[PDB]
């Protein structure tokens with residue numbers, strides 16, 4: 001019946017975040033769910049004397065008929081005291097992720113901090129007052145949960161870390177990441193093995209993530225248009241690679257010619273291009289990760305289902321860049337695709353640096369807030385802001 | 399009064415509420431409060447204090463409406479700002495459209511409920527207030543239960559009500575009880591007598607917990623008035639909307655009118671306010687009198703006719719689909735009606751022209767849909783199926799090529815003009831034979847003096863001076879010229895990322911005159927291909943205009 005006292009960042013107060021509207025279906029599922037946790041002592045209904053509140057909703061993470069309660073403690077976490085990364089995790093063949101949230105129900109929360117964990121189950125058309133609860137145990141999604149549980153966590157983990165001191169197990173929030181250079185059969189079985197050990201209590205490829213190369217258009221014949229677009233893309237890239245030169249190409253344009261006129265390249269321009277392709281055959285030197293600084297994930301809509309992104313801390317010094325596609329069935333849903341993208345990039349940022357990136361989403365606030373919850377499937381929620389993607393920024397990574 | 403567990407209250411950390419002095423009143427008021435108080439004291443409401451209490455609120459005596467008898471009020475105004483914050487009672491209020499049809503409906507006015515609920519004994523002290531007396535010769539009191547005008551009274555009462563009902567609701571799941579203020583709206587699909595009998599059970603149940611409610615003969619009967627509507631148990635109608643006809647129309651009158659007409663535009667079709675609104679231009683005072691114009695005197699008249707029309711509606715049937723159909727009622731203006739059965743509307747509404755920097759129909763339509771979707775999740779916890787005046791091909795073309803994440807729930811095209819379209823589309827490749835304008839524009843960061851022009855293949859050109867302009871204004875100006883001094887197919891190369899992006903987004907409405915003009919020119923052309931090149935480079939054509947727009 002022990003309880004480590006947890007407090008809010010000095011002078012801070014509990015979160016009073018409003019509950020967005022939920023669908024009948026998500027409400028029903030949540031009433032079932034909460035009634036259960038209430039019976040088991042996990043939570044308890046609260047009174048009006050508690051003025052704090054946190055948003056909650058329901059999801060279905062990868063192939064599930066049954067719903068999962070999800071609480072957005074982002075604001076509570078940003079207000080919770082601080083507490084206290086094996087680069088080996090990133091440098092693995094495969095890395096599997098595990099949801100250990102359940103573990104937390106086992107631990108009771110410092111009763112004085114409970115008031116802050118207050119959340120509400122809305123009623124359709126406001127016909128009824130919302131149902132108010134607060135946690136009695138450690139809530140999943142709370143930055144303090146993993147911490148206060150570390151102690152017990154490590155314990156239950158030693159056995160597997162001693163039996164297999166070749167695998168890396170990193171925990172982030174409610175997730176546990178395990179990476180090993182084994183082969184799949186033995187790897188997935190060794191995993192199933194870990195979930196066996198975990199149960200008697202309560203598929204990514206890292207060597208594949210990098211800074212993708214900027215490729216330049218090659219064609220039989222070049223028009224004035226073609227050269228301009230070419231020079232534009234290059235001129236931008238000069239920002240990342242000062243060596244990049246466009247003198248020769250610009251010359252080919254001297255004069256106010258038609259846009260479609262076919263321009264014959266010179267031996268000089270061809271060298272100029274030859275030379276730039278080479279400057280671009282690799283990422284710009286001297287780009288290192290700074291832990292004392294925020295990670296930033298920028299995404300641009302390429303269209304047709306494609307989305308390029310760059311993770312970075314300082315402008316033009318990409319720590320990583322990429323593209324995301326397909327996801328059959330989402331063939332007509334920009335929000336699904338974007339949400340999947342953000343998750344894919346978060347997990348990735350977690351693996352690599354063990355922290356989430358602040359997102360810059362090319363979407364209108366309203367659009368994203370209406371539906372993103374309908375396609376979320378993680379236990380965590382990164383931070384984000386909305387933007388108006390530059391016409392350029394796109395043709396460049398395109 | 400009630401025997402329900404009090405709620406634990408505390409004063410905002412640190413703060414404490416003892417002070418604000420007694421407002422000496424006449425001898426008629428001092429004794430007209432000495433009386434009323436002696437009353438409450440007995441009922442167990444207030445408790446003559448003094449024992450140990452430094453806190454104090456001022457009592458007043460106001461002429462009770464229609465009474466030669468006096469009534470009291472207590473300024474907790476101070477006490478409240480020192481009182482902890484509570485969980486908001488929820489200000490999102492039920493809308494007729496979300497109600498389910500019922501056979502019988504009753505409304506139980508719990509009214510005198512604040513004084514029926516126990517206050518946190520532990521906190522009572524903080525309520526103290528006094529009654530003055532000639533020659534300060536000595537009356538000190540403090541509440542024992544929720545006080546009329548205290549911060550937590552509503553919140554704490556509402557919560558007590560929820561608890562007290564909890565059992566009854568588990569017992570009678572076929573009965574619907576809606577809380578709101580001191581009111582209880584109970585509806586059911588039972589037979590009239592069966593229903594009347596459950597109410598009595600409810601009333602006595604509430605009375606067991608000390609909450610007195612009205613008799614079946616003191617009850618108020620349907621329809622009930624709800625934020626503008628008349629609520630019947632099987633349907634709803636709109637309270638008549640009477641427009642006054644006067645010879646004197648101060649500014650105020652004109653506004654309130656517009657105000658009511660706006661509220662009416664949601665429910666009624668074809669309401670207009672354009673000319674009543676014109677009447678407020680340059681007004682100098684609220685009391686000012688403005689003569690209604692001819693067209694003003696007219697729409698007002700045509701609006702009265704419309705307001706006579708009786709508008710009825712239907713409630714929600716969970717077993718049927720939700721369908722929302724939208725209409726473009728002008729640029730940026732949309733109309734919508736949500737229904738389940740053709741012509742039997744649950745709700746209707748209007749979204750006014752959102753006037754921003756630059757959009758277009760498809761985008762505008764998209765926001766409309768997002769709006770109706772959120773409204774619906776709220777009202778019904780469901781998203782309607784949409785019937786939109788746009789082709790899957792246009793939507794297909796728009797999104798497939800738009801730079802932002804955009805989406806629209808299950809929807810169906812409905813051919814009901816005026817339709818939403820893309821008024822023009824930029825070429826994806828240069829145009830052969832079409833002329834080629836290399837535009838540019840510039841301005842000083844100190845004088846705001848700018849030049850904007852172009853140079854083209856075919857020798858044609860033209861520069862022009864601007865005053866009080868910016869880089870972005872001149873750059874856009876440049877493109878306008880080109881669209882003017884050009885044929886029906888044009889290739890334009892600009893160095894303005896600004897200009898580019900605004901246009902790339904193919905807008906059909908803006909609040910900038912210039913932008914609007916260009917939009918027009920754009921709609922006109924047969925083929926337009928817009929291109930961008932980096933600003934100050936030796937890039938043929940662009941270096942040329944960079945020369946002319948530099949003095």
Ligand SMILES: O=C1Nc2ccc(Cl)cc2[C@@](C#CC2CC2)(C(F)(F)F)O1
Pocket residue numbers: 492496497498499500503504574575576583584585586620622624629630631632713
């Ligand atoms: O769900 C329904 N159906 C309904 C139908 C007709 C009427 Cl007049 C009233 C209702 C009701 C309510 C309410 C207050 C919000 C107004 C009731 F609770 F049943 F009373 O909510």
